[PDB]
Amino acid sequence: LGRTLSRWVWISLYYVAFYVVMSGIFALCIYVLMRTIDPYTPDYQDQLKSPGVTLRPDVYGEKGLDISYNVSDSTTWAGLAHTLHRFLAGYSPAAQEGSINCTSEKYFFQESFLAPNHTKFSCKFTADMLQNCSGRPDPTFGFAEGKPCFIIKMNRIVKFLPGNSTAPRVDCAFLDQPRDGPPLQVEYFPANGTYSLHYFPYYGKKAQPHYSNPLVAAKLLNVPRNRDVVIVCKILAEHVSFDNPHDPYEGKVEFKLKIQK
Amino acid sequence: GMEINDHQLSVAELEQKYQTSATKGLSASLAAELLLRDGPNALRPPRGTPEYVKFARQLAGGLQCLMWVAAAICLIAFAIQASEGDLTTDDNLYLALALIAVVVVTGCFGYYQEFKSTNIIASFKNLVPQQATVIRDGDKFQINADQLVVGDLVEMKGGDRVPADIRILQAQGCKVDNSSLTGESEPQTRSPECTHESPLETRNIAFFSTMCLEGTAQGLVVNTGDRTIIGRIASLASGVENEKTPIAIEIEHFVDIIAGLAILFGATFFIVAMCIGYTFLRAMVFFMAIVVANVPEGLLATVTVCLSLTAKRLASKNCVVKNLEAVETLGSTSVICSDKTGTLTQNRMTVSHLWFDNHIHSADTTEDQSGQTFDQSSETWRALCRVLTLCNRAAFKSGQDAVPVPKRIVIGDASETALLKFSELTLGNAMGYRERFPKVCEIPFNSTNKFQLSIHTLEDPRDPRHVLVMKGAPERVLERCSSILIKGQELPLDEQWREAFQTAYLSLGGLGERVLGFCQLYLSEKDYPPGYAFDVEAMNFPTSGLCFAGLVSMIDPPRATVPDAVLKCRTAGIRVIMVTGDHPITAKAIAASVGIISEGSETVEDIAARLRVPVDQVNRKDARACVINGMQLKDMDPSELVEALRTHPEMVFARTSPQQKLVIVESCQRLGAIVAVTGDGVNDSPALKKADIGVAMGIAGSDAAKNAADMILLDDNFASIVTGVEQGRLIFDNLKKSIAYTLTSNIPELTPYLIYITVSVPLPLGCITILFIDLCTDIFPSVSLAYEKAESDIMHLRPRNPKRDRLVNEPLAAYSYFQIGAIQSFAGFTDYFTAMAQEGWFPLLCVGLRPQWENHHLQDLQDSYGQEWTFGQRLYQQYTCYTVFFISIEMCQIADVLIRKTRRLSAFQQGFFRNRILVIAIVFQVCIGCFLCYCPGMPNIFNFMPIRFQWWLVPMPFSLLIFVYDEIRKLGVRCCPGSWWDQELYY
Ligand SMILES: Cc1nc2c3c(ccn2c1C)[C@@H](O)[C@H](O)[C@H](c1ccccc1)N3
Ligand SMILES: *[C@@H]1O[C@H](CO)[C@@H](O)[C@H](O)[C@H]1NC(C)=O
Ligand SMILES: *[C@@H]1O[C@H](CO)[C@@H](O)[C@H](O)[C@H]1NC(C)=O
Ligand SMILES: *[C@@H]1O[C@H](CO)[C@@H](O)[C@H](O)[C@H]1NC(C)=O
Ligand SMILES: [Mg+2]
Ligand SMILES: [Rb+]
Ligand SMILES: [Rb+]
Ligand SMILES: [Rb+]
């Protein structure tokens, strides 16, 4: 309505002054909040009792991962591979020069923070450990073959530990296609589909700047061609639980897979 | 046939028109056909009120059209969000139908509450079939009133309700009660002679609802049903369409404010939305999203419950209200236009003064016996009380020892029933005493002698002589007395007394009262021995030389609780105007008596009486009161009325028609007043309809007065109108208390969305939880405010100025959005930004993190530490950001309800616990919050999870900050009520 032109200034100055007094306490609250918070460890990590597990290559449709490709039509699978090549472009020996050969298999507790710029020590993981299915000797990860390779990868939680008993292994299996289909043949790389225990525990971007997650592949020989089938890849550890109905990726992956020819 | 021409026809002329006998009535066969042609002799009621259509209206109005418009926007947005395919659009469905639910459920609450209203009201009606004595084929017999047809021969007596519109043919002493149509409190004389051309002002017509008090007539039926003077008065009044209540207007100003912001708030953010870079469609969606965030879904319920509560507070006092908007109208009223007869007065002639023992005694004229009765200790009074008791033939109908004496119904004349309850109230058991003195002679009032007289054997047998007792017009008794009782002696009627009498008869004449003289004589036991055969035709006993007892005088007296009610209204700044169809003399009498015309104020017609200057030279500014009669008000205009109105503050309207009442109300309303008409009978229905709130009496009221009225007084206790101001003012305060509270919840509901689109942080607040706040957790607190005691002496305040003082004004809303709303949304963002950073997300990362955050195809997303979260995991974190932002709202809104307890006074001086409903609502508030979080499954049923107990307390520093900020603006507005602070920080 703009009744009193000059007194706006006073009420403008007032709101202006009012808001600035009010924005201050907010600033001075994150400022104190920022320094309540540890740069190393999550205060609560409340929503992560079990970790998530993703898969490559990731191709969704309506209602989740549906991977459908054609051995003969090199169009249907070239982009699934370039997904795997450029993903491992960060697992190359050259671009992982910042970490170290890890021999001690059972765990890794870096109590002392020893590496340049108050860093800590990250383990090496290069493409080689998925032997049949890196970029070389087969650039198409068994896709042109029709026995494709999928790599599985656990989400990291600072100071999360998956158990003492053994190595947590990926287990991928046919789901409800046994009537005439023999059970799924899968060769995992490294063998038995194991995750080596000396990548635990995770310490975070500040502690481990060049950290990289361990991988297991699954080369599926058995898969019937030109048949819609689903495949589930579950992880096995005592401190790991894979079935939450609100979160389907809590310890596993499902994917529709149709390999056409 | 027509109105003008029935009283002006000869018997030959009428009986030709209706093919009837003036002496032998209709035939039976024809009277039955006329009924087929004209239908019942009653009023066709207000026809057409379909039960499903009573319900529809409860869905329209200021808030409802807003809410519906909002629900529309929800669905257009939900659709546009399906073209550009969106998931979790269940929100827009959940949102729009929650809006369309509130509107609807309030319509039911309103409908059931008006249902309850009408049944309670039609529980107090009179449903007995009134009757007629008709003559047909030459048989006098009785029928129902309603079976009367035009042109019929009818008879009335004392006690008969006039069954139709009748044209008198012959009449014997027939006086009638017109107070329903006119204001006239004194019986009107009814004769067969055409008194006047206006059928209302003639005497040879009887009106379809009136009461024949005394006498007899025969006459012809000339109108029936809706075609009668009463039929016409209400068909007029229905024609009158009534304006919108002040409360209803206020609510709609409040909507022109809400939307006015929602549009201006929405449009700038949309224009900002385009520049951050957004498909026009999405920018125009967020425009939508936020105009709907400006609308409060729940407040249309809290308003309504608030009103119903004060509705019940009244009906507990027998004050029944037909709609809820009427619970406010009295508070905001400034002019009362009030009827005299039946509303201000009892419309019942009671004995009021008495000249005896050389003194004017004033009686008690109250129905509950609360006044000051007179001196009943004299031999003169005992004698006078004997004569007035013994010379009276009226009689209480049987079985009324329960009902109060004024309420008891008597067979007998006007003047005689007043004397009967008078004897019965003071002497006690009047008819019994009367029997102990057997009547041996009696003459009823005729013009042949112009008095009534009866001779009696006394009570003990040791007194074998007789008492003659006589009463009539005072002069006609004076010419027949030679003796006056005075002070235990029986003195001679010298000239001193023939002048004392005259000055008393006239002193009681100018008050507008009917005055009667009483007298007696003790006939000797020798001349008149037990058994003496008295004779009227040949006077064998004295009719002169009698002993004068005294004068008794009666008036139509105020209702007991009325003068105090007028005094309580006027002290509260309301103007009172009298509007009566009665003659100015008695009109001004009662207006003085009750408080319309203050003790010691004059008309120009009174100045000229003592100033002895012609009324023309008398000055107009000097006269405070003014009586304008109906004739005089005709030759005036809307300009000579307003100058009369704003000159004379104590205005009185005599001889005013049903329409002139409408006119007065209109001038006032057109001068910007909220008027209240307070009426009984049909002469008030029009006025009662045009009125901002029309108030009819529940017992003396007629059906048209009741039907036009918004509010009914079932005890007929005019003092309900005083408590109806204070209730109607309080809840108008308790509304801006309650709305100011519910408005500040919109800005901490909106900013998270405004931020969530403007800088793309993960969504901090979901509108399933906004629904929970607006409709589940904050309702009870907002209705608590309905129970706030006044913060001042409300009933000594002027009525609110409708132009300056609005329910919701710009400073009140701006105060809530921009200063209280601003501080709440800050207590969300912190508690949100910590819950993020505590769980892993640093604030500067939460910037622009939304696109990846909400992504279903990124199962692995890493936080500021670098842990990789999946979608449903950070969904749970976002749901937590909901539940954290939600209990940041409630912790302020405990500090918000306490602050909106009191607009000006410190909650320290008032108290934190005065309001007991408010405490129970805050314990209710903080219990739902707990149940929503820690009950199992709430994370999936709704968006509510078990919250870290550190996060409850994060906001509380902000709740106290609010308390202290309004406190210091409430402490600095009362201690320092200057100019700067009074306007900018106040509501
Ligand atoms: C104040 C507020 N509004 C919303 C909101 C959503 C989520 C949270 N919201 C909050 C906290 C979405 O479901 C929708 O975009 C929704 C919407 C509603 C009407 C018109 C257009 C969009 N608006
Ligand atoms: C891992 O092996 C040696 C240690 O035995 C290490 O120095 C070297 O960097 C790694 N091997 C190669 C081929 O680089
Ligand atoms: C992996 O490759 C080696 C040699 O290239 C071969 O012996 C082995 O059978 C391969 N695995 C599968 C599953 O074919
Ligand atoms: C796979 O691709 C080849 C080459 O385009 C095509 O001819 C063949 O029919 C495809 N198979 C199916 C099942 O569509
Ligand atoms: Mg009246
Ligand atoms: Rb809202
Ligand atoms: Rb008295
Ligand atoms: Rb009305």
Numbering used by the authors:
A (entry chain B): 30 to 290
B (entry chain A): 47 to 1033
Sentences from the paper on this structure:
The gastric H+,K+-ATPase mediates electroneutral exchange of 1H+/1K+ per ATP hydrolysed across the membrane. Previous structural analysis of the K+-occluded E2-P transition state of H+,K+-ATPase showed a single bound K+ at cation-binding site II, in marked contrast to the two K+ ions occluded at sites I and II of the closely-related Na+,K+-ATPase which mediates electrogenic 3Na+/2K+ translocation across the membrane. One of the notable differences between HKA and NKA is the presence of Lys791 and its salt bridge partner Glu820 in HKA, which physically restrict K+-binding space at the site I position. In this work, to elucidate the molecular basis of the different K+ stoichiometry in these two pumps, we evaluated a series of NKA-mimetic mutants of HKA with increasing substitutions.
Therefore, we hypothesized that an additional mutation of Tyr340Asn in HKA could change the Asn792 rotamer conformation indirectly and make the Asn792 oxygen point to the K+-binding site. Indeed, the triple mutant Lys791S/Glu820Asp/Tyr340Asn (KS/ED/YN) is significantly more thermally stable. Moreover, as crystal quality often correlates with the thermal stability, triple mutant KS/ED/YN crystals in the BYK·Rb+·E2BeF form diffracted at an improved 3.2 Å resolution. As predicted, introduction of the Tyr340Asn mutation in HKA unlocked the sterically tight conformation of Tyr863 in TM7 and assumed the orientation of NKA. In the triple mutant, the oxygen atom of Tyr863 and the polar side chain of Asn792 are 3.3 Å apart, close to a favorable distance (3.2 Å) for a hydrogen bond to form between the nitrogen and oxygen atoms, and certainly close enough to interact directly without water. Although the rotamer conformation of Asn792 cannot be explicitly determined in the 3.2 Å resolution map, based on both the improved thermal stability and the hydrogen-bond network formed between Asn792 and surrounding side chains, it is likely that the rotamer is of NKA-type, i.e., the side chain oxygen faces towards the K+ at site II. However, the anomalous signal from bound Rb+ shows a globular density centered at site II and no significant density at the site I position, indicating that there is only one Rb+ bound, and that is at site II as in wild type HKA. However, a detailed comparison of the crystal structures of HKA triple mutant (KS/ED/YN) in the BYK99-bound E2BeF form, and NKA wild type in the bufalin-bound E2BeF suggested that an inappropriate position of Lys791Ser in HKA may be preventing an extra K+ from binding at the site I position. However, in the wild type and HKA triple mutant, Asp824 faces towards the other side by forming a hydrogen bond with Glu936 in TM8 (Val927 in NKA), and therefore does not interact with Lys791Ser at all (4.8 Å apart).
